[PDB]
Amino acid sequence: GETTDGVYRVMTRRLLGSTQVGVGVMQEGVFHTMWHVTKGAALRSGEGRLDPYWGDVKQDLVSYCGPWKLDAAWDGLSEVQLLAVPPGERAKNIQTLPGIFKTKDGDIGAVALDYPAGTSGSPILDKCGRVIGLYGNGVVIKNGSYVSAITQGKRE
Amino acid sequence: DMYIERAGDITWEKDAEVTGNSPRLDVALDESGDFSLVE
């Protein structure tokens, strides 16, 4: 069905009413979201079907209809925008300077914005509007707030 | 059955709400894709 580039909501009619489980990005005919949103299950777009193509539970990412297309990276210096798509609320851009997640395998950018779990999959953008990652996989800090990593896949 | 609905264009918006801090956190990623605080 709908194949236009842009940000989309991922919904389900399995629970009470219509519930938003997450968000995703459509780009170059490929739908990109986080694994914990769909659990790798197939999606419906109008009257069409989107089948998974690639996924990895450790990276917490999944791509539909084709391989991962998003290849932009945070430069380690500039502020970025979280194009948040919250449940039952309109798309809203929020600008912030990312922090860092120091791991044994390298540093990763991290946005200190807190949004419901239904917001998972919302894109994070650079100055030219390119998608540098997805929001939704992070940690709960001392003061109870959520801090998400900037999660980016690999483009082959 | 999960379904998708369009929510908007992906663009940088000038003069957006500027909020949020920049913390440097020591973390670990487990085999199931879960992050945890290392202190």
Ligand SMILES: CC(C)Nc1nc2ccc(C(=O)Nc3cnn(C)c3)cc2[nH]1
């Ligand atoms: C702290 C609270 C007030 N807010 C809060 N925003 C959240 C966003 C995502 C998740 C979440 O569960 N993610 C995940 C990524 N991978 N998996 C398996 C599960 C939790 C959140 N909590």
